[PDB]
Amino acid sequence: GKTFTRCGLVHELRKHGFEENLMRNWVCLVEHESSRDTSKTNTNRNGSKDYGLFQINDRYWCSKGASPGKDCNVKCSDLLTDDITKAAKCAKKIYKRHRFDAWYGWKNHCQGSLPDISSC
């Protein structure tokens, strides 16, 4: 697991199939959820835990076990590896029903201001 910079994240998502017109929303969401860190985790009041760059939950999208086998066919520990793609492809499969509303940071802080990406 590693941390990314905004220019690195903008590029990593552009390579992983994220739209340049949505990139501002995506990086500003990710900067509140994981702070651009693949190693980040958070526990919930419901007893489940969140993993990887999009803080994906072991009961809803990824799987906590030794093998993948959940709604996005991906394992919580694979989201902690040095390429975000395991979390990013699952984030696209969520965006098919909830483009940004599946993440609390976007509706808590990205409604006020977004960062610039025109230097990336």
Side-chain angles (χ1 to χ4, degrees):
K2 65 174 267 72
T3 313
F4 291 73
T5 190
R6 190 175 294 143
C7 303
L9 183 59
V10 166
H11 288 189
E12 212 61 66
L13 300 173
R14 280 169 176 174
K15 289 175 180 181
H16 294 2
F18 291 65
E19 296 296 288
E20 66 182 90
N21 156 79
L22 302 182
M23 200 58 56
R24 303 186 72 188
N25 292 28
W26 281 116
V27 308
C28 198
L29 179 169
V30 165
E31 281 170 13
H32 182 102
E33 291 299 318
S34 65
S35 318
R36 319 192 293 249
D37 180 14
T38 52
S39 298
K40 195 154 302 188
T41 50
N42 282 283
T43 314
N44 299 267
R45 303 186 69 187
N46 201 19
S48 53
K49 209 188 193 78
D50 300 346
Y51 298 85
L53 215 82
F54 301 84
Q55 292 300 281
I56 310 188
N57 188 274
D58 80 279
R59 197 172 292 165
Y60 304 147
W61 307 115
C62 48
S63 190
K64 54 160 174 179
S67 295
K70 262 278 176 187
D71 301 72
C72 297
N73 192 28
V74 68
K75 197 177 77 192
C76 299
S77 194
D78 254 275
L79 315 188
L80 309 178
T81 64
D82 305 302
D83 190 335
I84 74 172
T85 191
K86 298 87 173 280
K89 287 176 178 288
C90 174
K92 308 310 309 297
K93 196 178 183 185
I94 297 165
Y95 150 105
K96 283 182 185 290
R97 298 296 178 259
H98 298 283
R99 59 179 182 174
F100 305 113
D101 188 66
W103 298 276
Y104 196 74
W106 175 89
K107 54 191 300 176
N108 183 69
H109 109 95
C110 305
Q111 306 304 297
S113 294
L114 295 171
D116 182 32
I117 60 168
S118 309
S119 52
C120 307

